[PDB]
């Protein structure tokens, strides 16, 4: 029959929409209409890390806010020191089709994954002083798009298997598997308390997952196009999402619906990376039109441009202390802005 | 400065020189290709050549070619196809006999051609299963005109080059498929990439030579465009 179940689901969606509309008192744009804007924000390239011979697909800042891990399609995972432009490491990747990389919060491990469907974890702090792969995390059906570290032993990977997974690095198995996404999960970001994390997928919906429970806490549907990047607010009570429709959208976890849409008529090119500042006031988005736009996350108005990349910007990260914004584009150059 | 700072600088210099040397070693006379197609197509048997992505390394004349057959992935391909926007060509493979899935081959090739990141990438079209297509046309059990009504208004091109011991009906059918693909490639073609059609059987062994010649043409046209001669 299935029609009774379809009708019940439709009524559930309708009443969820009604509850969301009832909770929708006033827009954040209306709330922030009183405050003065941030003003023009000019960021200059303090450092230009060169040494990648091909396009840089992803990067991740370290917890110390000094060492960043960079990944490219050449087949090298170069770890830099942004203060001195010193390549502290350069790991020969087995697979050159790496789409994501991460740096451990403790600083001892580095992960990477791509079209090989395997999350390779590299031990930086080895007794012999040479980098060796610690585990070949296999178990995903599709390509990995974004993997983040919870601890030295727990890692969460977003794959294009429409499923996020939680692994045990010591055992190398599926501690907890997250399912429910209709489309390829393209990026996830971890909450400050590491208890929750949201993920963006190719079904235009971002969902909030409980790491311990392993169940989708809630779903956010406000995007008209594929979602590519996602990042929590410094509260951990909100996040922003990028999408091919060139629209950044900020959702609130407790409100269960969006707050504002960071869009403009001129921008027509899709978003590849999204990152907040330390205070969350600045929403930096890396578009694939060869530059980046800094968005005033409160006034919802553009308040700066990070131009200087020749090719499409693929990755964009902000240090934990918020002293830099290192962008990495397809022109083989990774630029730190401040 | 300090001893630690000097050691860090020496390490950085050594890493940079190693990366540069390895890159110029592994990037000289080595071209990468994206082998794309359908399951019915003989993409696994295109080149005679004497767990999440396949690999095929072959050489013709002191030039190494790499083909990446992305097979262990989901049917949705709009996301992992952007990682292959640097290849010198795309080895598109089509089963000419299966007219049922020929239309999906056509619109897949159209999406590849019109993709924003694959606009520069030039497709080396490989119309495989020519023996099957010829057998179908000669038998006449399957009718191509029902699946393509515009075949009736089609005449074989004047400059066609059929094999001497071949049937005019088979020549007309295969060149109709070729023209279909070439019309798709030339309608929206911006001129920065070209479609190189070929007729491949399951027994052909010069597919490596065909790929070599077309990649030579691709790089030659790229150089001419770079130097403002084309």
């Amino acid at each position, epitope marked *: 029959e299935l029609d009774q179940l379809r009708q019940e689901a439709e009524q559930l969606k309708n009443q969820i929409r009604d509850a969301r509309k009832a909770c929708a008192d006033a827009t954040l744009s209306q709330i922030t209409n009183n405050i003065d804007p941030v003003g023009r924000i000019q960021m200059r390239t303090r450092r230009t890390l060169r040494g990648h011979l091909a396009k840089i697909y992803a990067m991740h800042w370290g917890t110390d806010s000094r060492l960043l891990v960079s990944a490219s399609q050449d087949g090298k995972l170069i770890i830099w020191d942004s203060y001195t432009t010193n390549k502290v490491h350069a790991i020969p990747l087995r697979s050159s089709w790496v789409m994501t990389c991460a740096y451990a919060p403790s600083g001892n491990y580095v992960a990477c994954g791509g079209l090989d469907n395997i999350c390779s974890i590299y031990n930086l702090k080895t007794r012999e002083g040479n980098v060796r792969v610690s585990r070949e995390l296999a178990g995903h059906t599709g390509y990995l798009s974004c993997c983040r570290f919870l601890d030295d032993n727990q890692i969460v990977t977003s794959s294009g298997d429409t499923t996020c997974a939680l692994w045990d690095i010591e055992t190398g198995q599926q501690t907890t598997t997250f399912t429910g996404h209709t489309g390829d999960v393209m990026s996830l970001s971890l909450a400050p308390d590491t208890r929750l994390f949201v993920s963006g997928a*190719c079904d*235009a919906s971002a969902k909030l997952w409980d790491v311990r429970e392993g169940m989708c806490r809630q779903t956010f549907t406000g995007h008209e196009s594929d979602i590519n990047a996602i990042c929590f607010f410094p509260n951990g009570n909100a996040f922003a999402t990028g999408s*091919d429709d060139a629209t950044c959208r900020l959702f609130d976890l407790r409100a269960d619906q969006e707050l504002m849409t960071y869009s403009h008529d001129n921008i027509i090119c899709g978003i590849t990376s999204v990152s907040f500042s330390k205070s969350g006031r600045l929403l930096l988005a890396g578009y694939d039109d060869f530059n980046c736009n800094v968005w005033d996350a409160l006034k919802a108005d553009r308040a700066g441009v990070l131009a200087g990349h020749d090719n499409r910007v693929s990755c964009l990260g902000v240090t934990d202390d918020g002293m830099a914004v290192a962008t990495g584009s397809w022109d083989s150059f990774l630029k730190i802005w401040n | 400065v300090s001893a630690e700072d000097k050691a860090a600088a020496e390490r950085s210099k050594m890493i940079d020189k190693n990366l540069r040397e390895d890159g110029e070693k592994a990037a000289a006379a080595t071209h990468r290709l994206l082998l794309l197609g359908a399951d019915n197509s003989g993409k696994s048997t295109i080149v005679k050549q004497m767990s999440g992505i396949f690999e095929t390394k072959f050489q013709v004349d002191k030039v190494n070619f790499h083909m990446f057959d992305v097979g262990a992935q989901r049917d*949705e391909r709009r996301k992992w196809i952007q990682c292959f926007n640097d290849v010198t060509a795309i080895i598109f493979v089509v089963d000419s006999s299966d007219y049922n899935r020929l*239309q999906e081959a056509l619109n897949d090739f159209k*999406s590849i051609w019109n*993709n924003r990141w694959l606009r520069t990438i030039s497709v080396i079209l490989f119309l495989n299963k020519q023996d099957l297509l010829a057998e179908k046309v000669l038998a006449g059990k399957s009718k191509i005109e029902d699946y393509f*009504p515009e075949f009736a208004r089609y005449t074989t091109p004047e400059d066609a080059t059929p094999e001497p011991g071949e049937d005019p009906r088979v020549t007309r059918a295969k060149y109709f498929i070729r023209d279909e693909f070439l019309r798709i490639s030339t309608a929206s073609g911006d001129g920065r990439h070209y479609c190189y059609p070929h007729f491949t059987c399951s027994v052909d062994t010069e597919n490596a030579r065909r790929i070599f010649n077309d990649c030579r043409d691709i790089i030659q046209r790229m150089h001419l465009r770079q130097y403002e001669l084309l």
Partner: nanobody
Amino acid sequence: QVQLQESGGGLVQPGGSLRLSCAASGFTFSNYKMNWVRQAPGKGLEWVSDISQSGASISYTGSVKGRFTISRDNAKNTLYLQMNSLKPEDTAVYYCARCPAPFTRDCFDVTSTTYAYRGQGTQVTVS
């Protein structure tokens, strides 16, 4: 929130005429290249027609060339497929599917098995 619910269809005698209509919500209907796809019983999805965002371009499958007409209403956010002079093989589940990205002339995953942007499917039967 992005529901491409379509209407019309049902049961019509062979050679009849059914007009399928599609309702698009949650996105700018004038930015996405709309598609029509059918799924025959026990068969994979087959792309039927394609109309550009502005409606200038247009294309059809060879099996339904001249027998199906596709039309979009940008103001009404509705997409139509004028099925007339039907044939027995037209019996299939029709989905109103849009191409994943706006301002793009390519459509990669429209015919996918579990594509995200498509309708539930209005059954069309002829006998």
